[PDB]
From a paper:
Imaging scaffolds composed of designed protein cages fused to designed ankyrin repeat proteins (DARPins) have enabled the structure determination of small proteins by cryogenic electron microscopy (cryo-EM). One particularly well characterized scaffold type is a symmetric tetrahedral assembly composed of 24 subunits, 12 A and 12 B, which has three cargo-binding DARPins positioned on each vertex. A total of three subunit B-DARPin fusion constructs were made. Together, both components co-assemble into a discrete particle that obeys tetrahedral symmetry and contains 12 copies of the DARPin-fusion subunit and 12 copies of the nonfusion component (four sets of each trimeric protein). As part of a project targeting oncogenic protein targets, we generated DARPins against the C-terminal domain of the oncogenic protein [name] using a yeast display system and subsequently fused the anti-[name] DARPins to a previously characterized tetrahedral protein cage.
Numbering used by the authors:
A (entry chain D): 22 to 322
B (entry chain F): 22 to 321
C (entry chain B): 14 to 172
D (entry chain C): 14 to 169
Write the structure that this text describes.
Amino acid sequence: DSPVVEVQGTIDELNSFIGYALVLSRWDDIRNDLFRIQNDLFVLGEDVSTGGKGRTVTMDMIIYLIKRSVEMKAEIGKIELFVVPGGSVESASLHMARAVSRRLERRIKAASELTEINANVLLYANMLSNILFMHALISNKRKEELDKKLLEAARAGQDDEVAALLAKGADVNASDYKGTTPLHVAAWNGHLEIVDVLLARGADINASDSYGDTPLHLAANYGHLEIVDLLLRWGADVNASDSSGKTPLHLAAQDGHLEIVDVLLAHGADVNAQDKFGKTPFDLAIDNGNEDIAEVLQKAA
Amino acid sequence: DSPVVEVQGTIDELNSFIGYALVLSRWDDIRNDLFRIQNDLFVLGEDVSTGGKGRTVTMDMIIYLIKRSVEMKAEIGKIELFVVPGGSVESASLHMARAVSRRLERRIKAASELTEINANVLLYANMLSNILFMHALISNKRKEELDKKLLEAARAGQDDEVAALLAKGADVNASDYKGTTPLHVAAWNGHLEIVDVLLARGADINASDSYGDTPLHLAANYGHLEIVDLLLRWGADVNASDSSGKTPLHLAAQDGHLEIVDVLLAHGADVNAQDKFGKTPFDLAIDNGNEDIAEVLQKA
Amino acid sequence: RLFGGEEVWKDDPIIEANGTLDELTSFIGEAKHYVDEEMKGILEEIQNDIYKIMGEIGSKGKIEGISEERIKWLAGLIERYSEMVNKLSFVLPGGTLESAKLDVCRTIARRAERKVATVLREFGIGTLAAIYLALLSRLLFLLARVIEIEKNKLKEVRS
Amino acid sequence: RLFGGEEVWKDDPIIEANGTLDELTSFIGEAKHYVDEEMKGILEEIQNDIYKIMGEIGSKGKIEGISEERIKWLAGLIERYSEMVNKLSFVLPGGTLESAKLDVCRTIARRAERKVATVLREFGIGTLAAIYLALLSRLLFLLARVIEIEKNKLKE
Ligand SMILES: [Ca+2]
């Protein structure tokens, strides 16, 4: 009875993975499917063990796996091939559950060559591999759903939406294609309340976008002093360089912000750092007509 | 000598799972056992490699796996069979570690047919599969232990107990047998402080119990405006339907809350929605004798 | 239960014999609508007998199949209709439309006889079923010739 | 080119499944001329799906076959028509001529299901096709019983 045991040990193994992705996936419909699958993995094992005497894999079991597999391919839409696994934790656990499910097919395809196995066993096995894959896809579509609202709510100053989004798992470090993160948008607009709640959840305090800007750059550029302090208290790079090479001191010296120049210099800004234009913070202060900033940089030596 | 290699690769594989469930299981005694198992999985590998020349799996090793396996089966009591795996993460990681442990038995049972392997290897292997199962059971018993305490503390208004519970892993979305969650109990009683920390952990803002009530329903039913405000701020369903089908505006109009009817209407309450008795918010305001609510809904 | 029904996914002599018999009884149900009342009742009884044979074969002999009385009934019909068929040396299949249906049924009955014979060789169950199928192919052949003769004789009256 | 056409001279599981499916679609084409307008359209969609299955099987899985939407479509028809058939313990095949045609189609569909199952065992291609064929035999059975019911109801 050697081949049927390895299947039982893989059915039992897959059930451990399915139960794991169940406790991770934060959506109700995915967990409903996964729990039915778990209770069906009992029947599927009982089918292989008894050879058809006890409980058997019914066609209504396979049919339900397809009913949901069609309902999910509608929300997904076009399914790109050659996609890398491990999108998000709820999705990634489902990807691993899928890979084990496909191994159970390989264990079933072997054992069927050594003992008659009801065809519905491999049919449900093949449908389980498919429906687990739709589970992971939907999980990532909804993770990108929340993250596109967190970047939106961080822009519109939605102190309450950002709360509901970060409480529902919206990735606080969600990076746009521009490289802009919700922490970037909060410092840009100037909603100090969101800057803290983002950093509390574990925001990347010095994320770089395409331009190379950090949240401290945007906070110094747009005259939001309150954000410059809390960013620097959290270890923001005070002399970070964007593509142009300008530091927060350069940008704070350009736009005529003395109280921000004073704070950035206090945590260790470089008066001698030069952008790619050779101009120092002492230069960009003189270039823009801001005098009281240049002397703070001049007397800083 | 090819089969003894596959056992080593599975011992090493199980050790990865054991160390993973160790860093997950938040109790000291479970981690205590798991750490010995890891250090013993080394000896178990060295036993299969040397065939008994170097370190060997001792009976005292198997003996300790049983001493702890009895101490845990006492706290559990009756262990129902055919129970679905993956209860909670600390348990689920242990369930997967068990499934790998049982695969190591199959790799050992195979290799033993091809090279002499000390019986204590499979005895410790078989006992390891069992003791990992008790770990998962205990993890869920203690996870369900906190969840009946979080549901309990949310009832008594224990602002301090909820702090220790949510910090120690008590599931904020823990559903009682009634379908009632701690957010339901906090809005029901009216302990506003707990409502905040619960939603902060990620409470299901519109979970439905057996009756179909949502946290916004219970908050509107028992006249806690402060709780109705914060629920709606998080996107609570302002026209949610229970088994009766009454929306929060229905319930707020039934029991005489003008300031809640007005605020629910600002976020999009339905003046004309009907329950299963056909009575609308303009009806149920008249039915219970509240007139200033009926006029605001009539002018809507 | 509705979505599932009955599903068969294997090739073994029992499954092949029952499928051919299912094909045979389905074609007889089609062909019984082209014959007269007398032949229609005969063909329906044959369908019932095929169900008994399938019950025996599908049960691997545990369930009782046809009886020897059914085989005698087929033999009496063959004897009765052989007198009417003044022996014809050769006749092209499908002399009439109704005769063509019966010839198709006869070929399926012959194939079913071969499949059931394979089952009998493999398991030793189904001797009476094989005898019934042999007599059934002979009887189906006789009925086609009788239909041709009777239809031709009415054609000679109209001229 | 005319004299030659298409010639098949080998016996393998792939060839047998496609040939039986050709028989099934030919018999469905015969039977669709005996049913009403609703059932005729249902049988024509089934014929296209049988062609898709043959395309998948004849290409050894390189060419995409039926989709899960087609299987859901069969299931909905089976669910819709199972309600009408108040369960009858047994009825002799070929109650009417149209019902007899559908019974012939059902037997060929069951045999084709067996052949396609052989292909799935041998090559691992045609899981969705096998599910469709199982549901198709049930639907053909249900349609035959419904035809019987309608002629009996007009007799009442
Ligand atoms: Ca044929």
